[PDB]
Amino acid sequence: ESGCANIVSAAPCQAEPQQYEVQFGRLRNFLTDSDSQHSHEVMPLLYPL
Amino acid sequence: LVDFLMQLEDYTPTIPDAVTGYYLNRAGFEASDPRIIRLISLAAQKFISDIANDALQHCKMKGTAKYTLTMEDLTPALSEYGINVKKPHYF
């Protein structure tokens, strides 16, 4: 982990004024519907994001 | 009139089944049924007969301006197919 860099060079260096809420908005729509068995280990992930 | 099944019976092969069958064994085939190993022999016959007929044409136009096969009747017949053979005649 000493200086891990995989997508660091390919970072999304775009302006994109309107990407975060539309992307994160898609997260709640797919991860909270029609999924209960694989949701208990990923529901906490939406909190720090 | 008649289907290809008994027409396959009518052919009289020259190469024995122990030669074509051994070729399949080398490549990893059983060679244990009579029916598949007749076309390879026929295909081999067609490949050699075409060269043989081509050599006959060259031999019958040699010096007419018994039949002996030499390199003069072989290196031009093999040239169209891509076979290049050149053997020294001395030393």
């Binding site: - | 006959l56 019958k60 136009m61 010096g63 301006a65 031009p76 040239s79 197919y81 891509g82």
Partner: protein, 225 residues
């Protein structure tokens, strides 16, 4: 020479005012094939021993396919009568080297050509088709002598091989147009020069024996048609 080309393309499937640069490309392809035909016949004459083109040389080169043999027999029988010595020469040449097939005299190619020719006359188009007949290498001969026979130092055609090459060039154009139509068929499911270029590429790559897994069986003089 382009005026003769413009008239003969009307009898083919690329009629109704085709382009002129396409015929130039056809002329260049035909010229190269005829030069190769002259070059390829040189070794046969050298191998034979004679210093002149024998009448059997032109049929000895075209000994592979029998369908084209039938058309040559047709052209030397009916159209070559309006003769007596050539009929016996062909029979003597046929009996000179034959085992089972050549000692004989539906092809699905010429019948298609005549059916296509009749289809073009259904569209006065019939009058135009009739006037376009016998306009290929038949009205003039001085200019056709200049187009061919660049060096002509060792072996030259005397009287008869001059017309045989003209007929072969006409058959080369007919086969070249036929290949162009075959390529155009793949397009739907005036001919662009991309069609003839693909036909040449497909005609160059053969499927000869001992081809796979080896890059040593290279290519030589492709053909003469």
């Amino acid at each position: 020479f382009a005026t003769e080309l413009q008239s003969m393309m009307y009898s083919l499937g690329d009629a109704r005012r085709p382009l002129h640069e396409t015929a130039v490309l056809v002329e260049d392809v035909v010229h190269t094939q005829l030069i190769n035909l002259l070059q390829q016949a040189a070794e046969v004459s050298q191998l034979r021993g004679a210093r002149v083109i024998t009448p059997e040389d032109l049929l000895f080169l075209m000994r592979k396919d029998k369908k084209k043999l039938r058309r040559l027999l047709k052209y030397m029988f009916i159209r070559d009568y309006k003769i007596v010595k050539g009929i016996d020469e062909d029979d003597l040449l046929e009996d000179k080297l034959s085992g089972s097939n050549n000692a004989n005299k539906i092809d699905e190619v010429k019948q298609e050509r005549m059916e296509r020719a009749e289809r073009q006359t259904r569209i006065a188009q019939y009058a135009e088709f009739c006037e376009s007949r016998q306009l290929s290498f038949s009205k003039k001969a001085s200019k056709f002598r200049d187009w061919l026979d660049c060096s002509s130092m060792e072996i030259k055609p005397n009287v008869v091989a001059m017309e045989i090459l003209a007929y072969l060039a006409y058959e080369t154009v007919a086969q070249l147009v036929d290949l162009a139509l075959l390529v155009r068929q793949d397009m739907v499911t005036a001919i662009q020069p991309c069609h003839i270029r693909e036909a040449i590429r497909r005609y160059s790559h053969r499927i000869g024996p001992l081809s796979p897994f080896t890059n040593a069986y290279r290519r030589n003089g492709m053909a003469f048609l």
